[PDB]
Short mmCIF file of C-alpha atoms in Angstrom, two decimals:
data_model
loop_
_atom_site.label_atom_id
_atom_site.label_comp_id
_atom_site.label_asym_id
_atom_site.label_seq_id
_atom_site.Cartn_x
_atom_site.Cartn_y
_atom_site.Cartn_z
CA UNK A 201 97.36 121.66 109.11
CA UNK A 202 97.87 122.56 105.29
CA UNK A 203 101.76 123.64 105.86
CA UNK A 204 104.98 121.78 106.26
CA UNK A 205 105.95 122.39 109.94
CA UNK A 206 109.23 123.98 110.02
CA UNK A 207 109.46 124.17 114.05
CA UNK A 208 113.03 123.01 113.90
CA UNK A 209 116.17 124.20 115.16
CA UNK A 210 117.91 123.70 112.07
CA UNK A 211 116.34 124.24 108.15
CA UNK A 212 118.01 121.83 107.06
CA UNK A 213 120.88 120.44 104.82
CA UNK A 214 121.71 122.14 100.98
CA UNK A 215 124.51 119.95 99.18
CA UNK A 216 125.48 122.00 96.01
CA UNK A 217 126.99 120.08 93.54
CA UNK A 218 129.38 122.18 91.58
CA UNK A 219 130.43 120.67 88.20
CA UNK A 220 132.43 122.76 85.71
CA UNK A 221 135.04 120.91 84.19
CA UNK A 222 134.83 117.31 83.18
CA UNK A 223 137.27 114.38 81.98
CA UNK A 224 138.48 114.35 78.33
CA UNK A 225 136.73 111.06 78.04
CA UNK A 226 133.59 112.67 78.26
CA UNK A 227 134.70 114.97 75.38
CA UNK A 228 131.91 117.57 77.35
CA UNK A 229 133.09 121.57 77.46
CA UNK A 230 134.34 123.60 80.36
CA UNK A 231 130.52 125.12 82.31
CA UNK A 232 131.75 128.52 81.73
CA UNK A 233 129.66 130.76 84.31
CA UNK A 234 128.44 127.76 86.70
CA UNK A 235 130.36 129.22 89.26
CA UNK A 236 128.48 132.52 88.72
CA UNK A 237 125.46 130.28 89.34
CA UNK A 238 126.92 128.44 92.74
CA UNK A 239 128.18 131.62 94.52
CA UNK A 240 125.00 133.10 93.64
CA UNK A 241 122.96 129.94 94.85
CA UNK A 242 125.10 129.82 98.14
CA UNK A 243 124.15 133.37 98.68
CA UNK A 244 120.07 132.64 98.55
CA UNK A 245 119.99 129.27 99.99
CA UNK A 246 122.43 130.32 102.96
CA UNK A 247 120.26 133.60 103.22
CA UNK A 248 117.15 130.97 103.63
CA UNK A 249 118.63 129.68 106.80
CA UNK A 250 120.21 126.23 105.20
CA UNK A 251 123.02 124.56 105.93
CA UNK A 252 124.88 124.64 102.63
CA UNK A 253 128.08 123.04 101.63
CA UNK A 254 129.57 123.57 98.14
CA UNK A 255 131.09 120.33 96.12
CA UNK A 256 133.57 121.32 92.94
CA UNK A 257 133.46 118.92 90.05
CA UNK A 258 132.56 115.83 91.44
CA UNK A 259 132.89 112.56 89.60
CA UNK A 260 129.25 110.29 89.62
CA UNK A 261 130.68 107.40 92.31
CA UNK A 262 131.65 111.05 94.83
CA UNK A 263 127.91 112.19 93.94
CA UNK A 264 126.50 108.95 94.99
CA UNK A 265 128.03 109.08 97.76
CA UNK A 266 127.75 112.87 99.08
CA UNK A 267 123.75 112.05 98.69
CA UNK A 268 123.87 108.57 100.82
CA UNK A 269 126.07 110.06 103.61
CA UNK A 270 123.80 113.02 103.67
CA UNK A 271 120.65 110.04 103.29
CA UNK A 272 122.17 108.76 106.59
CA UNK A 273 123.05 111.63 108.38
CA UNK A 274 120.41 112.76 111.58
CA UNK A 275 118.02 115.01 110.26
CA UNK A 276 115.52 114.73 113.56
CA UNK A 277 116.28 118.57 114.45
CA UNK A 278 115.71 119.15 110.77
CA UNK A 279 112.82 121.11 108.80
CA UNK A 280 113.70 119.77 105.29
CA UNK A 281 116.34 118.67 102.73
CA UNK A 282 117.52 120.60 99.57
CA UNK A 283 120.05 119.26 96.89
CA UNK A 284 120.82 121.61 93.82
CA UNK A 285 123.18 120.05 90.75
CA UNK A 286 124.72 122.21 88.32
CA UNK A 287 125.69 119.94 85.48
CA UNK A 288 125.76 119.11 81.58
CA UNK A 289 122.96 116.48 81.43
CA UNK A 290 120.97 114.16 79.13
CA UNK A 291 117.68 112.54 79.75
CA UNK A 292 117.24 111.27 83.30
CA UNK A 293 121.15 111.35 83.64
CA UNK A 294 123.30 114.12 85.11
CA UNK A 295 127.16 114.10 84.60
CA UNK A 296 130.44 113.76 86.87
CA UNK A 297 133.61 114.74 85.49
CA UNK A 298 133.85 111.22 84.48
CA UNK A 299 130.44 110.02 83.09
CA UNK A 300 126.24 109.98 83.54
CA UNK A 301 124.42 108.67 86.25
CA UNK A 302 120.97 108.57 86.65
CA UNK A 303 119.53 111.22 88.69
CA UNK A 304 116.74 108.86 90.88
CA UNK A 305 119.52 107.35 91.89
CA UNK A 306 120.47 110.61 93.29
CA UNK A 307 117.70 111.16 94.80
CA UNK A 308 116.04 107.55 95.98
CA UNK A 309 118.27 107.74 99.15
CA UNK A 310 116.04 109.51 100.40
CA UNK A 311 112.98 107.78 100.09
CA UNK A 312 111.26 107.42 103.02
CA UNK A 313 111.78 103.84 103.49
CA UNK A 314 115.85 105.01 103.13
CA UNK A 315 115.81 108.38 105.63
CA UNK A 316 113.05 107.79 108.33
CA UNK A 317 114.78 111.07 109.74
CA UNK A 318 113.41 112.53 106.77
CA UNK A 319 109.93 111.42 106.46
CA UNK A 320 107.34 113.41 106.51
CA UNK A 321 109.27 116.11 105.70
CA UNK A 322 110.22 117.80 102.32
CA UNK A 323 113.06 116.62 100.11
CA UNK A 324 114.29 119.62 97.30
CA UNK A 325 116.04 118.81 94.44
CA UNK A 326 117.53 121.59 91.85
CA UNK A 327 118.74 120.72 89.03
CA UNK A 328 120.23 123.24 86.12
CA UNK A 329 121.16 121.34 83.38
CA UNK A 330 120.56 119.99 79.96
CA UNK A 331 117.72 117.92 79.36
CA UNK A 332 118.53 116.89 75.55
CA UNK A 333 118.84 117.85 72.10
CA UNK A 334 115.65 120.05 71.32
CA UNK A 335 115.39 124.01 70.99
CA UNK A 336 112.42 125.57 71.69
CA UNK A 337 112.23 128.17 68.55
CA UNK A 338 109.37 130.20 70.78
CA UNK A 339 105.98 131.78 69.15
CA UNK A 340 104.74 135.34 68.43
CA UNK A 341 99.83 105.66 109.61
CA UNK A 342 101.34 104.92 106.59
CA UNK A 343 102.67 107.11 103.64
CA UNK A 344 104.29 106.43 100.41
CA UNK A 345 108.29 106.21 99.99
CA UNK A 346 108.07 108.62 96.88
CA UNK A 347 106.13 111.31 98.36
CA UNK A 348 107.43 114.82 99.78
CA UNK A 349 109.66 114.65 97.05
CA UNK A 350 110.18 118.19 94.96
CA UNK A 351 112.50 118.27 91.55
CA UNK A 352 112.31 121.88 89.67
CA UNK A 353 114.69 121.32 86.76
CA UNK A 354 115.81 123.90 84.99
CA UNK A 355 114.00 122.86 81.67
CA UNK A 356 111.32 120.56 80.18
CA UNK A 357 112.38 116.49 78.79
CA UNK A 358 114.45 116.85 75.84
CA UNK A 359 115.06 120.61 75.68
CA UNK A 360 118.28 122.09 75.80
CA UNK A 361 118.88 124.37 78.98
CA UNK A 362 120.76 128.00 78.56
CA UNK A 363 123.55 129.34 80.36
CA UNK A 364 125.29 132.52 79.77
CA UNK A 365 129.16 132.61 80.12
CA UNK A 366 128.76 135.83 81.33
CA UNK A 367 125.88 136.07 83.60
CA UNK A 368 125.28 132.61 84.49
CA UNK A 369 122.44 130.07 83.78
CA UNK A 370 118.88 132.06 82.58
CA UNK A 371 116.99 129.64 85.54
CA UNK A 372 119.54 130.31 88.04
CA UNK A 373 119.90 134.33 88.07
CA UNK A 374 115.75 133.69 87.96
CA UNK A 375 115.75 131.82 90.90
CA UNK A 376 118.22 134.02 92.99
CA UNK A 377 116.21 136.92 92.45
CA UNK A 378 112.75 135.94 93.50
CA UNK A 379 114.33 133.89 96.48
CA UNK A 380 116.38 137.18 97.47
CA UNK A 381 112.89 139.17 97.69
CA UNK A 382 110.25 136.52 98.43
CA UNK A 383 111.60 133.39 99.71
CA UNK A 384 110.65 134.35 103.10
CA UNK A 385 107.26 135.34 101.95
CA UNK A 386 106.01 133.23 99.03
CA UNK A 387 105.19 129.53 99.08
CA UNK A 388 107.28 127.29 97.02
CA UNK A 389 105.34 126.97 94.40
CA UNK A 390 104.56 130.47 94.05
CA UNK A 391 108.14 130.58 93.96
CA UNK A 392 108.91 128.46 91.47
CA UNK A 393 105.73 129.73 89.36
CA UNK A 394 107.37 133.05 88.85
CA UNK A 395 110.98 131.69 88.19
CA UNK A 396 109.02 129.98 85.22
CA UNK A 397 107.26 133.75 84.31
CA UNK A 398 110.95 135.27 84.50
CA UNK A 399 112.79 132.72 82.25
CA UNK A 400 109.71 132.14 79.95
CA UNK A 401 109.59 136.22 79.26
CA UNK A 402 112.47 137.83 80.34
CA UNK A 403 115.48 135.54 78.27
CA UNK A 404 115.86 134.77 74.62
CA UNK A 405 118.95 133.38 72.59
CA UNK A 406 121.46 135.15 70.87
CA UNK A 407 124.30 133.38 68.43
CA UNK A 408 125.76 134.20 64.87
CA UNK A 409 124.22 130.65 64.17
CA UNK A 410 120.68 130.45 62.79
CA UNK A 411 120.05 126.75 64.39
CA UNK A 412 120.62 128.66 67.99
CA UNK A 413 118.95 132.07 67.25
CA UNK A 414 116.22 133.80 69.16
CA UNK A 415 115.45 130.69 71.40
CA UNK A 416 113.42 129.92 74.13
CA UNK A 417 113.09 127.91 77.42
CA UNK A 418 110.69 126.47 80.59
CA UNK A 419 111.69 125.11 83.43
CA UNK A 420 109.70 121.96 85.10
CA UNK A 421 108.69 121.46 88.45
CA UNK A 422 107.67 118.14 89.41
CA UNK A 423 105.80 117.87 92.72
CA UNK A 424 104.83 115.47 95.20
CA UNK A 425 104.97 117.30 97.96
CA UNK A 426 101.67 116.71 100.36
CA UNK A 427 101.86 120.48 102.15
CA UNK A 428 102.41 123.99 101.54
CA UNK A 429 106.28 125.16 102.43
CA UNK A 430 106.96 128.47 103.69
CA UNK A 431 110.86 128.47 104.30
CA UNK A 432 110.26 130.61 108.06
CA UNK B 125 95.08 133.65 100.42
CA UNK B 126 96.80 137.16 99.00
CA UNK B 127 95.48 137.40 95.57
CA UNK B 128 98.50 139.56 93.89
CA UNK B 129 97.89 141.66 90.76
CA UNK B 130 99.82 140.59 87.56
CA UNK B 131 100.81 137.28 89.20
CA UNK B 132 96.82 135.37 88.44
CA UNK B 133 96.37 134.02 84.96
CA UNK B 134 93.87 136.58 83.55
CA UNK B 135 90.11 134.56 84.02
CA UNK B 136 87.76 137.48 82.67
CA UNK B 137 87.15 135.25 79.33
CA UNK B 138 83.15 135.16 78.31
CA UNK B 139 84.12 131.33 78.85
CA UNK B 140 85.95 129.44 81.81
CA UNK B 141 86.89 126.32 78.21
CA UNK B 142 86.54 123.01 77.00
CA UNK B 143 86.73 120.19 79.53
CA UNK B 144 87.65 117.22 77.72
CA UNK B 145 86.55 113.72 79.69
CA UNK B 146 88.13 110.12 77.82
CA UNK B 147 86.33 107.44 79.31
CA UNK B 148 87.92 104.03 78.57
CA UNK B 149 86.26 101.15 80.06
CA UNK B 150 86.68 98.53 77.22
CA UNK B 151 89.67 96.89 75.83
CA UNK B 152 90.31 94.75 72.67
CA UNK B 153 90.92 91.22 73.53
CA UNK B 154 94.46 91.75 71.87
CA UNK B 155 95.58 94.76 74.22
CA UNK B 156 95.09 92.02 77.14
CA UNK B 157 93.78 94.82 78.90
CA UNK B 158 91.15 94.47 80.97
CA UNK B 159 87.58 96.49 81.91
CA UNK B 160 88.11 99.31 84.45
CA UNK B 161 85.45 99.04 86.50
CA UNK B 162 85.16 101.74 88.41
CA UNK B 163 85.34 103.96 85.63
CA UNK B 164 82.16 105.39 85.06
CA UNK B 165 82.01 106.35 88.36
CA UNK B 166 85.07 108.41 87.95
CA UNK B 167 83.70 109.84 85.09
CA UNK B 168 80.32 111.06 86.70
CA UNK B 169 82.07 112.59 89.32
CA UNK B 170 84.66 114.02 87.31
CA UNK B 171 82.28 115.60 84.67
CA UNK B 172 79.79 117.24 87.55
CA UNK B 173 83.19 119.07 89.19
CA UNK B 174 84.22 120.56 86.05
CA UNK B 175 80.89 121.00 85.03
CA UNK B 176 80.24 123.11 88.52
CA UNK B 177 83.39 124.81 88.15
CA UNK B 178 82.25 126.21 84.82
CA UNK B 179 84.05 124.07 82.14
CA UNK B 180 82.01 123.19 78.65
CA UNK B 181 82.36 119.37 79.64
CA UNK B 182 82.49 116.76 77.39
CA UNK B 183 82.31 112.55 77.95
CA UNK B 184 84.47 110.64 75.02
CA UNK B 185 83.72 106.91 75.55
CA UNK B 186 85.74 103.52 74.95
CA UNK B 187 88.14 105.59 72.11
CA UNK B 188 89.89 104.31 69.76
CA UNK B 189 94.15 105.51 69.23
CA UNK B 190 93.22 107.36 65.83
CA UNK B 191 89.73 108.60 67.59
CA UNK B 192 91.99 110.02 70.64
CA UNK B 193 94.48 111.84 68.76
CA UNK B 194 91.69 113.36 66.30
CA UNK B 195 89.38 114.81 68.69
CA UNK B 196 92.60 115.99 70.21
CA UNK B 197 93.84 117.52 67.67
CA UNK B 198 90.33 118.72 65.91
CA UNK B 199 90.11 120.34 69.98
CA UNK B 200 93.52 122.17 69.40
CA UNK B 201 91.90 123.87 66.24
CA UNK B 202 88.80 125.17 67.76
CA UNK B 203 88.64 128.85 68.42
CA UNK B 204 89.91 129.13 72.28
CA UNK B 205 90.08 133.00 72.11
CA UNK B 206 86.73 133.46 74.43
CA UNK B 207 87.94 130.84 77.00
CA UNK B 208 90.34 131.55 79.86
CA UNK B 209 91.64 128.18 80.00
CA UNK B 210 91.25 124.63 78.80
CA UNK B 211 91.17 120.71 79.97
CA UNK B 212 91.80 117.40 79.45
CA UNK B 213 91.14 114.48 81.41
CA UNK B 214 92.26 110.88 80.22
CA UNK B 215 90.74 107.96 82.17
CA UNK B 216 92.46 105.13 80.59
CA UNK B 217 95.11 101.76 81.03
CA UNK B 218 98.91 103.28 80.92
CA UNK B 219 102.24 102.35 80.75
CA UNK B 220 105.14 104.70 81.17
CA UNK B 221 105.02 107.64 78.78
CA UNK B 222 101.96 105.92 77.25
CA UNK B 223 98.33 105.68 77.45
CA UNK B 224 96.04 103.31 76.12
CA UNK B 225 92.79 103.48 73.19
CA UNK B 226 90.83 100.21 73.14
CA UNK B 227 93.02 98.95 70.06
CA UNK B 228 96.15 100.05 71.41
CA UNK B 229 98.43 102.55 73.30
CA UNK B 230 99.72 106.40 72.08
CA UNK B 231 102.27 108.39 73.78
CA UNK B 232 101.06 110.80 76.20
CA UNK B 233 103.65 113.31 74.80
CA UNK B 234 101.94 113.34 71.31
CA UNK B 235 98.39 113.80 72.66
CA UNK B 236 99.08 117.19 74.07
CA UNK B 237 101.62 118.43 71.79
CA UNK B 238 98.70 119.21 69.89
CA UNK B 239 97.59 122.19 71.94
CA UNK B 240 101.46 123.62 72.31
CA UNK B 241 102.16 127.61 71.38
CA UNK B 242 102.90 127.58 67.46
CA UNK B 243 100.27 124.57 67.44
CA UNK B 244 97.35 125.73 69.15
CA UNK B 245 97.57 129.77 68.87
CA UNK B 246 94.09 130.55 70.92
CA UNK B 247 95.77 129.12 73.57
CA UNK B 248 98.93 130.84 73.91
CA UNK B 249 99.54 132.27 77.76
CA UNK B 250 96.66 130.31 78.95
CA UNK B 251 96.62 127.24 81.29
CA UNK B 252 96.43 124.03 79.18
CA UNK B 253 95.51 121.66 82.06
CA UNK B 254 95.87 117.43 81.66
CA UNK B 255 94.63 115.06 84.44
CA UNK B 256 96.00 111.94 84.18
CA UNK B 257 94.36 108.86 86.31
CA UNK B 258 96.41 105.59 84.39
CA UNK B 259 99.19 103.43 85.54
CA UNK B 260 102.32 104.44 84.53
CA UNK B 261 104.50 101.17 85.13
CA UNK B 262 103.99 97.79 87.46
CA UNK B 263 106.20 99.10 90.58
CA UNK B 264 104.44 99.47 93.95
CA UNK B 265 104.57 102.00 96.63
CA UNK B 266 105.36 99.55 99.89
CA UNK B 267 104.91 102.08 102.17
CA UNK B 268 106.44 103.18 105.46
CA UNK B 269 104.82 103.41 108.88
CA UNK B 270 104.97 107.27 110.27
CA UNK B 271 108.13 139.47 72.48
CA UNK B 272 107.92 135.49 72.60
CA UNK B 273 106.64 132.43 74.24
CA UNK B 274 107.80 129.03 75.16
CA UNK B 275 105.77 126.76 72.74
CA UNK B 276 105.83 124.56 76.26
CA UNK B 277 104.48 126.74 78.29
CA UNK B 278 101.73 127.03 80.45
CA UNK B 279 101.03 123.10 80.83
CA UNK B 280 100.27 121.21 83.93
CA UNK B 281 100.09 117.68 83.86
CA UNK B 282 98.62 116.46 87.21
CA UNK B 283 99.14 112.70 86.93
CA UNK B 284 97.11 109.80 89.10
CA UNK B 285 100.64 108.15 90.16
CA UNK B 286 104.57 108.69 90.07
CA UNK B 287 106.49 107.68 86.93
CA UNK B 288 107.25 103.86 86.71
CA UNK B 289 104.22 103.08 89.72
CA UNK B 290 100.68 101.37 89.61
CA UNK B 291 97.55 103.57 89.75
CA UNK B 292 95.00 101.89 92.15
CA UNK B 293 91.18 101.88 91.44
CA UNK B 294 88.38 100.55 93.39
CA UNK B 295 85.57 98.92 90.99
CA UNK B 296 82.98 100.36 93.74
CA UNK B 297 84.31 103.46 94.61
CA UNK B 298 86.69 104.50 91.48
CA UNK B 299 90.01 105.55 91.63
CA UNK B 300 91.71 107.08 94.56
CA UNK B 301 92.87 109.95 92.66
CA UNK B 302 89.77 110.86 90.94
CA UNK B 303 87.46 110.37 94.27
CA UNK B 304 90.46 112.68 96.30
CA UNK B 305 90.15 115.23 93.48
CA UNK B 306 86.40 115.72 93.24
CA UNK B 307 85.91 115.92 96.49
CA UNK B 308 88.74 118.68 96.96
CA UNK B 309 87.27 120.38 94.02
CA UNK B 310 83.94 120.36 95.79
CA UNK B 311 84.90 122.48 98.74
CA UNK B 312 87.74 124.68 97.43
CA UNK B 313 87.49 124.87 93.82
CA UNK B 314 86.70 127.85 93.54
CA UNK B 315 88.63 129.41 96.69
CA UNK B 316 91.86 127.89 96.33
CA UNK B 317 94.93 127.95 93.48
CA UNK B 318 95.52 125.11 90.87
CA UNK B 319 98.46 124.39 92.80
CA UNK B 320 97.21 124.31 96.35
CA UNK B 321 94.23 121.72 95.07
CA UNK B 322 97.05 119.17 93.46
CA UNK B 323 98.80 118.85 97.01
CA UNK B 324 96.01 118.58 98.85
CA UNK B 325 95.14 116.17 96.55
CA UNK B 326 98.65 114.66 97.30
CA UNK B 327 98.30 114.76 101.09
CA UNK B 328 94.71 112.88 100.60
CA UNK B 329 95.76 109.77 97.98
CA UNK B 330 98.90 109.23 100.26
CA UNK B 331 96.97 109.52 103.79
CA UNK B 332 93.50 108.17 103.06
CA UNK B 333 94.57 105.53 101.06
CA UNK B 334 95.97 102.19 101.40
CA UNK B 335 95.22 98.88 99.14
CA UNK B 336 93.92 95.49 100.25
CA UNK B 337 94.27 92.63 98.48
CA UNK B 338 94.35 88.51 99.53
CA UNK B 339 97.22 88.90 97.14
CA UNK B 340 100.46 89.92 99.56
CA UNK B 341 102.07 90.71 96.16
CA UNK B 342 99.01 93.81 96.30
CA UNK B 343 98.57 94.23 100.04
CA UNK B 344 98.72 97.10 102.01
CA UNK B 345 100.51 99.31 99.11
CA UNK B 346 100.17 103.21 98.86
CA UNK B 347 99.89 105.86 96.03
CA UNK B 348 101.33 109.57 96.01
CA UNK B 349 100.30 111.34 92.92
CA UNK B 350 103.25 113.45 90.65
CA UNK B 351 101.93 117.01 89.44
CA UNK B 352 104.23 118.76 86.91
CA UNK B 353 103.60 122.45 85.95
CA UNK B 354 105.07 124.44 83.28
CA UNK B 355 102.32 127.19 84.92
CA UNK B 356 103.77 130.90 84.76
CA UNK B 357 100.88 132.08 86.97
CA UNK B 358 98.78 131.37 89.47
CA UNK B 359 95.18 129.66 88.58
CA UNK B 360 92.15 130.47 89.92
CA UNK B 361 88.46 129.06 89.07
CA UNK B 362 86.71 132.33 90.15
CA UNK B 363 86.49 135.87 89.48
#
């Protein structure tokens, strides 16, 4: 009634999009640590019961068309969709190795007039990278074609988004954990609630740079989902 | 639902908070904008639910730009300290990122930057909650036959309609967002998480819904509302 139905024999397809090292032209740095964050991600989301495939530095015309393929693959015997991009990124744009491209047109494929196989159902979108320029210094019948839609990105519009060399992206390690001890348990947005508690408190900046000092960050969900989702 | 210990935003305030209701019906000639009619309506039913739920609700009506932001702003420096949480509502014409005042439009953005963490301090790791019922473009659903702090923190903007869409309003019966809220917020208000409400909400505007217009360029369309949450707990009306 109020839940997704996830009587399916499969959970569904998980492209991760795996982009660490990008074109001169670009003139954007080497993702040190993403890869911390995509073996970590193919851990939890595999772990969930998803199909997931993992796609190393792909340019924007391959991204395109990983999503369409997947937009027009069968998903009758599937539950749900779930896309996760690890990227540098600007506002509304994620990058390939070789430029931006706008990230609805990532994900519009899969409207439902675009993936009737998909209707009705839920359509996940991940998306760990930056979101601009600003630092947050801290304080103290029918349906619609856009609906079932669900984009938690890793920070709010125009705020940068922090990754660790080391230890990977703040959001990422955040979601792994809660996934790897309530993803079979918690609904989504409970989820995704305390992934916002953990990088809210738990993470704060540290360079020899005062600009970059003791910062902060919140990730986003955006929602149009129409049910609860229990991934089991 | 399992109700889990340090995972509820802490509601033993002596107030629930300010429930902030901006009633624009009436347009300067120059905006081309037109009357809402419908609008009252929403705003009747609208102010009873939050009233019910325990908000200190108040009706703001035809506003100015300069009489939006102030308010707003003269809100954000009120003493929040005894109130769990607060609200704003904003019943107005809207374009993308921006909302109109009967003289004009302002961004959305700016209006509730206001109440942000090193802005509005008796707010800090409480819900700051912003219902939006505007358009937010000209596009058309078609349809388909079946220790520190974030000064960003803690928002939820539950908007009427998806970014670059129309927002549909009946002048009878008000807009479908505002009549699928109430009436949610009627039954489970005050059994049921923040969350849970906005996408039951969402199922409701995208089932229950669909326009009808002798204009083809208007008939038939649909509407799925776009919730965004900042939240770092769950919300709960009640104990």
């Amino acid at each position: 009634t109020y839940q997704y139905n996830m009587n399916f024999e499969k959970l569904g397809k998980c492209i991760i999009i795996n982009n660490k090292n990008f074109d001169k032209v670009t003139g954007m740095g080497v993702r040190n640590g993403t890869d911390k964050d995509a073996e970590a991600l193919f851990k939890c989301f595999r772990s969930l019961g998803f199909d997931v495939i993992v796609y190393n530095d792909c340019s924007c015309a391959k991204m395109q068309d990983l999503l369409k393929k997947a937009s027009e693959e069968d998903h009758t015997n599937a539950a749900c969709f779930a896309c996760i991009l690890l990227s540098h990124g600007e506002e509304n744009v994620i990058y390939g190795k070789d430029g931006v491209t706008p990230i609805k047109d990532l994900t519009a494929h899969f409207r439902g007039d675009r993936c009737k196989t998909l209707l009705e159902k839920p359509k996940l979108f991940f998306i760990q990278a930056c979101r601009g320029t600003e630092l947050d210094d801290g304080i103290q019948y029918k349906i619609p074609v856009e609906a079932d839609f669900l984009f938690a990105y890793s920070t709010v519009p125009g705020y940068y988004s922090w990754r660790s060399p080391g230890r990977g992206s703040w959001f990422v390690q955040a979601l792994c954990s809660i996934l790897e001890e309530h993803g079979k348990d918690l609904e989504i947005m409970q989820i995704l609630t305390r992934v916002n508690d953990r990088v809210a408190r738990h993470f704060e900046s540290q360079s020899d740079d005062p600009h970059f000092h003791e910062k902060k960050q919140i990730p986003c969900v955006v929602s149009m989902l129409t049910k609860e989702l229990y991934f089991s």
